[PDB]
Amino acid sequence: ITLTEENAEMQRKREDLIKLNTEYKLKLKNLEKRLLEELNNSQGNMLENDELMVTLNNLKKEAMNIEKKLSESEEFFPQFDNLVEEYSIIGKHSVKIFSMLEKFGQFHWFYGISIGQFLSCFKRVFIKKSRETRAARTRVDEILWLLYQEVYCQFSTALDKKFKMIMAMTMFCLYKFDIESEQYKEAVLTMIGVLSESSDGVPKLTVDTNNDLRYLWDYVTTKSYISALNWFKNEFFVDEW
Amino acid sequence: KSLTFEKERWLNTTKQFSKTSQELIGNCIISSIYETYFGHLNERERADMLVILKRLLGKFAVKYDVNYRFIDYL
Numbered sequence: 001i002t003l004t005e006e007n008a009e010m011q012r013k014r015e016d017l018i019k020l021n022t023e024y025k026l027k028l029k030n031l032e033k034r035l036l037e038e039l040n041n042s043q044g045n046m047l048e049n050d051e052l053m054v055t056l057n058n059l060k061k062e063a064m065n066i067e068k069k070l071s072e073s074e075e076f077f078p079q080f081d082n083l084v085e086e087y088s089i090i091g092k093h094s095v096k097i098f099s100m101l102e103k104f105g106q107f108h109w110f111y112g113i114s115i116g117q118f119l120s121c122f123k124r125v126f127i128k129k130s131r132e133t134r135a136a137r138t139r140v141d142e143i144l145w146l147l148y149q150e151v152y153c154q155f156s157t158a159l160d161k162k163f164k165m166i167m168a169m170t171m172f173c174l175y176k177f178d179i180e181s182e183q184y185k186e187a188v189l190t191m192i193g194v195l196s197e198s199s200d201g202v203p204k205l206t207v208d209t210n211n212d213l214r215y216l217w218d219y220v221t222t223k224s225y226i227s228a229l230n231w232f233k234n235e236f237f238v239d240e241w
Numbered sequence: 242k243s244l245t246f247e248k249e250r251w252l253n254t255t256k257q258f259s260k261t262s263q264e265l266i267g268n269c270i271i272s273s274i275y276e277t278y279f280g281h282l283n284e285r286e287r288a289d290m291l292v293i294l295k296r297l298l299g300k301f302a303v304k305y306d307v308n309y310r311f312i313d314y315l
Contacts, residue, residue, distance in 0.1 A: 035248075053242070053244065056244050056248070060244070
């Protein structure tokens, strides 16, 4: 669905090119068998003596057409298989998101989620053409950020406030673990450990590299826990419906 | 005639069948295994067993089509 919506041109090109290649192969086979049958004749008829001489020049043209179209195919299909990587990483994030939603769903009978709702949400992010937003580099990162925002704004409302903050924090960390550097992940992991008390890490800070984590340290060291929790929702840049 | 030579080389381009006659065994192995084993497997499981089978084919060294599609091969 995502490849269709993002670029269905390459799809329809692939199907039409494959079908036309098969049609050209079969009709060239028909021409070749006709030529073989006429070759079996000593000289053939007028349709065979000179008429299929020019028809065989047409066969040359048909072979040239098949060569150029298979060249186009070998130019196009590798590009398709090259650019499916972005949609692959989208799926990589999405499967983790779905597993996390199922993990929430098994905790309480009300928090369940079906595949259809997730598919509808993923259809929606594309259907909703957001206004000029932050320059999230290329298309894949932008639509991944949109997908995270939409899965939040759709499946947050089914959770109470505690599970809302749990899911917001988990999803923000899940996004930032891959979209950012390993230092970012280590700092947020040890800070979350600091937030917990049964298990905790080493209080650590980095200067002038991760600017938001500076605000996080400011919040935590002041023992303002509610601000630390709602920071994830504040900087995740969505409105609670 | 002159066109007879241009078709002479085209009919002599049977090198494509020559190379195809080298990976038939591996492709048939993969297709038969797909038909029998993979009836009850999911997409992730099917992909894992396909990569396992391809690595096994490499370890035993028998030619198989890299651009293999089970649907299109049958």
